[PDB]
Amino acid sequence: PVNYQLTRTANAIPEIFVGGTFAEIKQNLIEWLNGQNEFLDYDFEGSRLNVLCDLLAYNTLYIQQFGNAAVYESFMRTANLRSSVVQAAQDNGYLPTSKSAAQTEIMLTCTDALNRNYITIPRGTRFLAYAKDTSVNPYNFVSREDVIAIRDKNNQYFPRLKLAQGRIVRTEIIYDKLTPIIIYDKNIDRNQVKLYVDGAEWINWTRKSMVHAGSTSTIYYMRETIDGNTEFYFGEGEISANYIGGLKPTQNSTIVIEYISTNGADANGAVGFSYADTLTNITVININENPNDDPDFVGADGGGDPEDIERIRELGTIKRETQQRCVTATDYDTFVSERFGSIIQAVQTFTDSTKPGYAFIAAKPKSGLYLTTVQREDIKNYLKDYNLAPITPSIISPNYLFIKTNLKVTYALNKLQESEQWLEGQIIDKIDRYYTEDVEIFNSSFAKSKMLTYVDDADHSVIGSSATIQMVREVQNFYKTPEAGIKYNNQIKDRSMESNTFSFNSGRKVVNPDTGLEEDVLYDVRIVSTDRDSKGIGKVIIGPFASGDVTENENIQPYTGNDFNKLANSDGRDKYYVIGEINYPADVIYWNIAKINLTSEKFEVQTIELYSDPTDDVIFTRDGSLIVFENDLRPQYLTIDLEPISQ
């Protein structure tokens, strides 16, 4: 820096601990043993009084680890060995989500023979789901909560509910007050637990679904006691509450714990569900709609497995900055996290200045792309209870920039074993592992060279690799684009930004053979961003047109020339219409088809890709827009060539 007083240091283990390399210990002991003290009178020997020095140095280098390790795992940031880490994270009010279970919301169409109104659908209601990898075997599902239905018009019910993965288990115990009640099994999401004490309720403390202002006692506690087996216990209370604390049981009670077995994260597949329902006259009519909400759906979400060590720490210390409340942008990031986490990979919450209130939250699920709903409304509620009262949280989701690879790994036929396929898929996750590690998160770029070094790491036989690249960014509403929106953040390499597909309708009738007629739904269109010019300029065009439908007037006169503005391949009769700006140096796209004044009904479905290729090799990011590649959901752009070599 400038002024030397700013040097300080980061977290630094002082020279007091550190610990021996051996022979340096031999050096310091000899100087302390021979010198300053004795000037040997030793009766052993010339060599023995020497030799015996390191015989007690191995005693030091030993006791300088066995007993010196404690201070390493005593603190947090410097500790290793999970157990100490976790156990020291609860006094920061965290807990590390030992495992997780899949969750969806399905709407059952069923009906009853009794026709009775207000049919119920109790807690368990065992379902089973393949969570498809191919077909064979189910897992399990349980609704776990309540709901209700209503009969309307025709006699049917829509008892839409939500469901967790595992089954349930209930172990009742007599409280001895000397007996640290626990579980022992490798399971039991702490997110969803009940734990009645002989009456009901006992909403505990560490995790609220309500927060039930006041309500005093009846809380309990859940921590760790290392070992993987969760600890339950109760406060210091008396209730002869006395003043403040947990109600405590009284010396003998039936304590009924019920948890969810949570088979594991293997269940992310979801898709087809079956009733498996035996209760009463409910028919279980099926027509089960797994995703009746909104756009594209991955199946279930969550599934957990225990959090890694490098995760906990970062979330362990930051929760001292908060106390069980979110007033700050960095707080929502910690509240959208292992509490509600495993359903969200990254957040970066922010507040827009033009629109007060309304804390905006970008989130990417591990399932990829969009959170759908009711997994969003769920994130909504869990915040607003701990939130800053007037402002309402909202989930916008980030603005996704994917990339189109088209890479070729060029292996050698000699050294393979499983040959193609298995390697075709082995290259997938390695690429996928690159995203998840480096560029999955915000503000981070990626370099295709770094993707290729994980590509070349596939197994052995793959030698060399290479790719073209295109940055794909898909518009939502289309037809317009927002005001000064739709920006790559990178240099666009003009003569790029190529269309997608589109289509047309109308165009009079144009009857065809066979049946009566058609709507002339063929003859598509597509957009091209043309050239650069004196500074930015460059315009853009909507696409190929034959004749007829448009409003020409004086303001259109469709043309860019036979110059660049490359041509779509069809009959198509050219006559490209000018539409919008696209300033190159500061990356901006602008369309507003209303310039040429067509009808939106003449266009097919919106949400069209555009995908210009980048100028520079490395692709940057800003303004809360991720670059993350997820294959399994959208295969549409990934293409790889295995073209081999025979030696």
Binding site: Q5, T7, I13, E38, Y42, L49, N68, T328
Partner: protein
């Protein structure tokens, strides 16, 4: 206050002058206990005085260094930062509650 050096305590746990007749056994066994126990930086001290070093204002304490505010203050005086960041990690509950 010096705190015990463990030197006199285990000094009697040795079998006196027996089995080694030379004084070089006693004076050496003396000064080896020092390197384990008597001192600031040696193991028995650095251990026994742990949990006494958790309170940051205490001398020789650390781990306040790792704190986010010890890292971010631009005070030009070098000693004040180690005074205030050693403070405020003593009572963090004040600021975090009041954010």
């Amino acid at each position: 206050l010096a705190d015990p050096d463990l030197r006199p305590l285990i000094g009697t746990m040795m079998p006196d002058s027996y089995l080694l007749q030379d004084s070089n056994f006693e004076a050496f066994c003396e000064a080896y206990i020092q390197y384990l126990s008597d001192g600031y930086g040696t193991q028995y001290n650095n251990l026994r005085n742990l949990i006494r070093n958790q309170y940051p204002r205490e001398e020789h304490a650390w781990e306040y260094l790792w704190s986010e505010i010890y890292k971010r203050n631009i005070y030009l005086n070098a000693d004040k930062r180690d005074a205030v960041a050693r403070f405020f990690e003593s009572r963090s509950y004040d600021f975090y509650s009041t954010k």
